[PDB]
Design a protein around this ligand. Structure first.
Ligand SMILES: [Mg+2]
Ligand SMILES: [Mg+2]
Lengths: 934, 931
């Protein structure tokens, strides 16, 4: 209770008018969206609202917007963005649920740029209805009963946050109280907060908050759509609270995320089909150490059901999932020769005490599956530890630079060779980037004005109509904008490719075949590395790591040993359950609940590496303070019985929100450590070991109830290190070397001595080159006489003209006006505005032939061809980007028309849909070129 | 000798003029491939000879005949097949070799339809110059010194053979004598015969000649005179191999002719000749690695390098000096030195390995990624013979087949319901990639692709729907009907978990006797399941064909981590009494592939039989073991004696190679008798299996087996005499008394046929769908009359465009009538040409767009297409689609376009040809469509 805030925090939500009370939920949502967007008051008695019965039977939101919009006070604009039909229909008529998909209600709040109280404080924008995979909780209670927002973090220091908040210490407590203390009215439902978490110049970080529709004007009581139901009951259903009062309440709150986890429901197992183990697999040496933390077995038939319901090409050996209170990985049991369904759970997987009685507690839900692997490369954060652990550091660093030079050289040579033939460049462009998901989503290649959205898609669209990247400069320009952007990425990220490396799910050996420093890695298919291929790993040393590696010991060198017993387990890496300490825990305190290891079998990288033992970590208890307060201790303030328990549940939500919304120091302490280790050039001295241990403890902050605030951070740097004082940014944060003399630090050296010269050298190759193209014949020009085809045709006519003539003059004039418009807000919207003026350039008997009005799509007429070519003749000069962006599409048609030859096959006019479904045939390319080359 | 036949063959070959002794060998070819076709001769007179040149410096062909025909001349329908430029260039300027390819001189002889005696007997046609992979012999002596012909076999037997030869018994000796006794003049060279064998593909035999001299050669002891006897002595180092049976020695000549890639020449210190093979550990003395040896890892990387393979191959089939067989990477090789070994069982003659060409590794083939083999019908009788429960075996195979049949019929019918899906199915139903590669586009006949399948996709890609447009519906139907025929004629048992795999022997002592190791180079996919290797299961292995009950064996797949690096080969134990390979129809490790099957249903019921007690067939099978040394005894000693002995061996061995092949005949008899007996394990079956097994090695075993022997065998051990009928399953229908009882009969006629016929009833019930079910699919499409209606509207206030439109309709009508009225593609073209001939101030300039080099991209072509459609969709649907399909598709794609719903794409013919349907798009897109 500040109050300052309030009154601000009014009144934050859009009102729900009486004329709109006959819903339905989806209409209410999407109509409210048109009103907020157009800036139209929903409690306006000047507009004569109303309620279109027709909206009730609507299957396209555009129908409940063209209403409307109409009215005159809606124009505007167009948009909102608009929910897809299939989504809208599901929300309207399919229960907010389409197979596995939930319809999602979401909003983003940004600080009100306004001011004074009684202005809101937050502006709310409602997202369009959308599909996202469901979760336990939306399958149990209905997707329509869940609402999520992104909201500016109230403890965000700083400086672009309103004064009103935080120069008024605690009302951080007022914001949370607003969030949690009562219900929020939105679109005729009563929403109550039950979860908060971090989100999925310098902006204010937002936190994601989840609300449950406890009631609304359509619900009904109760005990004993759609029935009233409290958040305390919902969470009791999820967590079986009666049996979990012993738990620290912050930790218990953190388990709510397991009901929100986006997962595929696979199958419900019978009780007799479930094996709950009372004990984990423990260290053989008596350390009491858990050797299979987060991992269990499943039967083979269970894994086949997962292939089945998910539609996988193959039975997966392991999956990341949930099952009642159990969370982690399940791996097929290699000893299963039966065909009966079963699964097991271990104490380390079970996050609360669950009776596993209702079918939703006994349903296997899949988050992700072990899939075919792809090369990982080397991230620059691994480098300092790799260098630290090198038997010889000068050679390590010479080698890593050579590798980066070579890989770069290698990717340039392949690009420039492929460029020499359209079939080959198309194949290279296709392989460089996946567009299939975009294509599946739109039922076509999406266009911005006259060309595809995507640069890659633009290249192939144009080459498929006969343009040549070595002949047309525009194709050339894009081809190298692309190679530039990729150089930028390499110097920023230093993602040096290492062909023999992959991220692989870690699994523990239940079967007792791997000795302590042995790992088993078999692949589901051929893993290719330039000249060499692998279906498995055997008799070689490998490096394993989890990202991020901080301690010198966070990367380990071990022996890859293929065990025939584990032959069936593919695309996972199995660690021994022998020894004192599981290998997983040595890899940055990891485990087997979904962790993936960086696995590297590259000889040059593996062979110079020397293992370090675990660090003696410091006691940080003075700075890191765990709140261990249990649900039982919170309930003692209210007493005993159902009302006591209900209020305790809400206490837990409120205290845990107050915890979740505190600043994240993980990021801050990680950056300090980056900076400190950089200046010291050491990842193994005492300060380095202290900070690595620090950030290691902050990773589990949320479920450990670790309190760590600003005063404690300062105290810890004061007492154990620095340099309150900002440490300078590493030099490698800048684009050019701003250091003194030669780079000494390995990242500076790799970015500045190696990558930057090599890039600029590789770019001096084809600017050279440009330049070498006047008329060697080759080279690459903007001009193409083929595309002035219709121009010259109608100028001849035009001559000759009378008055075609006049038509042709207006045309050139209008194009000129629109190029001027192109010369002068987000980018795609502005381009569209110009595209629309472009399309508005419109024309007995000559106009009828140019117009072909029997075609519903204007942009397929002969006029569009003429307009495109005239614009080309006039502007290929001059404004090359203007012409291609507006008319790319018809330039392509003209090109395919013009290059066609009698008796040399037929050009194909493909529908947008049918075109999106084809891919380059790599065998064709390869075989066709092979015959071209004798 | 033999009175006639001579001189009824002493010209045969041109006929090599004054006068063209000059100008490169290629030029000559090639020119003497013109008196050949078409005519002229020797021999003149008229009209002008010798020189051009270029000719004597050309780079085409092509040309040359462009000198030609002065002449005038012929004028003989200017068409010889014609050698490719790069080939001709190589033969002209590149030594007949580039770099791995040899230029090949070949001809085909057919019997002279003429007669009597002074006429040739053979007509010879010279093939155009061509590239083929070289061999040891062309690399050593030059591809230009070798000439090969196909020649009718003088011992066939019969009917369509000239009189002329047999019934003049033993002029078969006269033909061979002609072939071998002396030199043959051809294009200015003197060719001598040194090898004969059966053809690569009245049966003809392939004969090989070597240019011993010619009017460009030079004395000794381009280039130099050299005898066939010297060339063979270089190859086989005859001095040290006189101990060999001369037929077997002759057989080894094939090793010099084997088409191989030269990889690298190893130094002497890098070669390891073992004096002994790996022998049975039981003391049987059996060779356990027959035909196989190890190579170092660096050698195998050199093979990947020079062959441009994507990976190091674990094993290769090759030659190396006298050694023939497989070489496998030594898994124990941790060095990087080049080495190879040879074994007695690999070495086919005593070789010093001195010459670089005796020490060059030559690759015939390499172990490559595997694909599914399925089950060959020939294996079924033995699978059934060895079934623990034959009733259950037969039932599973039929169930397997019924299910496959119903699956593939239901999949076509389902795919039909969505154009993305039907396009995918159509694409997967037949491969068009090679046609597309060859043409640089999809070939069209008139207005539509050549191919029905390509037509379906072309039309669907512009927006037509096979459930809506009857034209597409009729084609799809036609394809299934057509597929049904093929199924009835081609019984197919489908088995995903099987492959043919190169057999290799375990040099490393890790596999127990009934264990095999199989690792794959990549994922071997079978519908629901994938394998990168085989472990902990039983597998069946066999070599095709399997004859004896024991020719298929069930063994244990055990993955040995020591052998993990060996991929796409199967490794057999070198323990036990007898090598597994030998049990697989007398096989070995020199290139044999095993049928490997790990399908549980097929493996499970199988019970191993032991090796059969084979009968003594000495009386019928007669081995001539006469050695080269015994042949040489009739001439004496020294170089002259040796030379004539070599020619002796060619003559004698030609006489042996040209005798009828009974392997085929005895194999057919066995199939027919075992079918009648419904037994592959009774006494006549064992006798016939043992017979054909002995006939496989006939050539290098010098086994003589003629008609008298075959008839005596049949008489004594069998058998009619008497022609066995064909098995019922060689006829298309069952005819056939009652129910099929033979397993193949049962599967074909009792299982497959009733399923196929139940499916020809499904389609025919849907033919009568039909009337006006509103679906129905129709020929009518108002989209396709687009331009028609547009121009009738303009022609209404005509005045003028009316007249233009009236001529158009008229001329289309004339061409429709022409379509109503040789071969097929030629006639269609004629009509297409008249159709394209239908051609048109400002309106005609807009319709014509003459700046377009391709007429058929005109707005007029669109107008012509739709007015033809409007006027004829009803009456002559095939006419309009055949002529105008192309533009009907353009119209459809234009019409069907909607603003803000994406852009149609005008693809070039070439760029369209290089795209395939994306299976993942199909699959993901429909998944989204279905909620
Ligand atoms: Mg974990
Ligand atoms: Mg063999």
């Amino acid at each position: 209770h500040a109050p300052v805030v309030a009154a601000r925090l009014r009144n934050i939500w859009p009102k729900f008018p009486k004329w709109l009370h006959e819903a339905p939920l989806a209409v209410a949502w999407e109509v409210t969206r048109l009103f907020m967007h157009c800036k139209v008051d929903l409690e306006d008695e000047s507009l004569g609202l109303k309620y279109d019965p027709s909206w009730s039977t609507a299957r396209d939101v555009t129908d409940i917007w063209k209403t409307l919009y109409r009215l005159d006070a809606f124009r505007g604009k167009p948009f909102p963005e608009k929910p897809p039909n299939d989504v809208f229909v599901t929300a309207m008529t399919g229960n907010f649920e389409s197979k596995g998909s939930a319809v999602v209600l979401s909003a983003v709040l940004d600080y009100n740029p306004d001011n004074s109280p009684t202005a809101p404080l937050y502006l709310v924008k409602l997202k369009p209805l959308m599909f996202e995979q469901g979760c336990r909780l939306t399958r149990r209670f209905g997707p329509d009963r869940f609402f999520e927002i992104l909201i500016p973090s109230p403890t965000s220091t700083s400086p672009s946050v309103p004064p009103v908040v935080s120069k008024q210490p605690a009302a951080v407590e007022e914001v949370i109280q607003w969030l949690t203390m009562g219900q929020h009215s939105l679109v005729g439902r009563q929403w109550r907060a039950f979860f908060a978490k971090d989100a999925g110049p310098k902006p204010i970080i937002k936190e994601r908050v989840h609300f449950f529709a406890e009631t609304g004007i359509t619900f009904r009581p109760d005990v004993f759509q759609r029935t009233e139901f409290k958040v305390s009951q919902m969470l009791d259903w999820l967590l079986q609270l009666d049996n979990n009062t012993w738990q620290p309440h912050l930790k218990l709150f953190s388990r709510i995320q397991l009901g929100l986890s986006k997962t595929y429901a696979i199958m419900t197992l019978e009780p007799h089909q479930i094996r709950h183990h009372k004990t984990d697999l423990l260290s053989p040496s008596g350390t009491g150490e858990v050797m299979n933390d987060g991992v269990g077995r499943m039967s083979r038939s269970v894994a086949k059901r997962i292939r089945d319901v998910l539609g996988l090409g193959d039975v997966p050996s392991a999956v990341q999932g949930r099952f009642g209170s159990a969370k982690g990985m399940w791996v097929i049991d290699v000893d299963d020769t039966g065909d009966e369904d079963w699964i097991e759970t271990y104490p380390s997987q079970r996050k609360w005490e669950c009776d596993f009685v209702d079918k939703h507690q006994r349903t296997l839900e899949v988050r992700s599956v072990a899939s075919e692997l792809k090369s990982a490369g080397l991230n620059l954060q691994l480098l300092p530890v790799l260098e630290d652990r090198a038997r010889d550091k000068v050679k390590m660093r010479q080698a890593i630079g050579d590798r980066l030079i070579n890989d770069l050289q290698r990717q340039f040579s392949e690009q420039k060779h492929a460029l020499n033939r359209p079939v080959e460049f198309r194949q290279w462009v296709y392989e460089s980037y996946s567009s299939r998901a975009t294509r599946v989503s739109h039922g076509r290649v999406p266009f911005l004005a006259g060309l595809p959205d995507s640069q890659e898609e633009t290249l192939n669209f144009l080459m498929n109509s006969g343009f040549d990247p070595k002949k047309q400069k525009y194709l050339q320009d894009i081809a190298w904008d692309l190679q530039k952007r990729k150089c930028d990425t390499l110097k920023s990220k230093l993602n040096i490719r290492v062909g023999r490396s992959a991220y692989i799910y870690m699994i523990a050996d239940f079967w007792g075949v791997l000795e302590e420093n042995e790992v088993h890695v078999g692949f589901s298919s051929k893993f290719r590395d330039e000249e060499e291929s692998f279906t498995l790993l055997s008799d070689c040393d490998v490096l394993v790591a989890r990202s991020p590696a901080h301690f010198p010991s966070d990367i380990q060198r071990v022996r890859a040993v293929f065990k025939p017993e584990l032959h069936s387990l593919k695309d996972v890496i199995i660690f021994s359950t022998k020894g004192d300490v599981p290998l997983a825990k040595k890899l940055s305190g990891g485990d087997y609940d979904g962790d993936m290891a960086w696995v590297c079998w590259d000889p040059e990288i593996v062979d110079g590496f020397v293992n370090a033992e675990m660090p003696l970590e410091p006691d940080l208890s003075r700075y890191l303070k765990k709140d261990k307060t249990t649900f039982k201790q919170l309930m003692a303030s209210h007493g005993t019985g159902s009302a006591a328990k209900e209020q305790t549940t809400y206490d837990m939500i409120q205290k845990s929100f107050h915890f979740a919304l505190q600043p994240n120091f993980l990021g801050m302490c990680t950056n300090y450590k980056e900076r400190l280790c950089y200046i010291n050039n050491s990842v193994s001295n005492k300060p380095a070991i202290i900070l690595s241990s620090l950030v290691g403890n902050l990773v589990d902050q949320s479920k450990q109830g670790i309190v760590f605030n600003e005063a404690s951070w300062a105290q810890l740097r004061r007492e154990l290190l620095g340099g309150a004082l900002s440490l300078p940014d590493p030099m490698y944060k800048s684009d050019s070397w701003l250091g003194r003399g030669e780079p000494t630090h390995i990242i500076d050296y790799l970015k500045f001595s190696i990558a930057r010269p090599a890039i600029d050298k590789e770019l001096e190759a084809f600017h050279n080159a440009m330049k070498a193209a006047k008329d060697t014949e080759d080279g690459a020009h903007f001009w193409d006489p083929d595309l002035a085809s219709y121009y010259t045709f109608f100028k001849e006519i035009s001559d000759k003209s009378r008055s075609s003539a006049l038509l042709f003059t207006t045309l050139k004039n209008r194009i000129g006006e629109v190029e001027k418009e192109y010369g002068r807000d987000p980018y795609p919207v502005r381009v569209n505005q110009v595209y629309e003026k472009w399309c508005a350039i419109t024309p007995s008997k000559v106009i009828r032939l140019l117009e072909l009005s029997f075609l519903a799509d204007r942009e397929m007429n002969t006029w569009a061809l003429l307009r495109a070519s005239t614009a080309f003749k006039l502007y290929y000069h001059k404004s090359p980007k203007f012409v291609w962006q507006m008319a790319g599409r018809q330039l392509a048609y003209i090109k395919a028309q013009m290059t066609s030859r009698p008796g040399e096959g037929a050009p194909a006019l493909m529908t947008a849909f049918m075109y999106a479904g084809l891919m380059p045939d790599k065998k064709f390319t390869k075989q066709y070129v092979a015959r071209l080359e004798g």
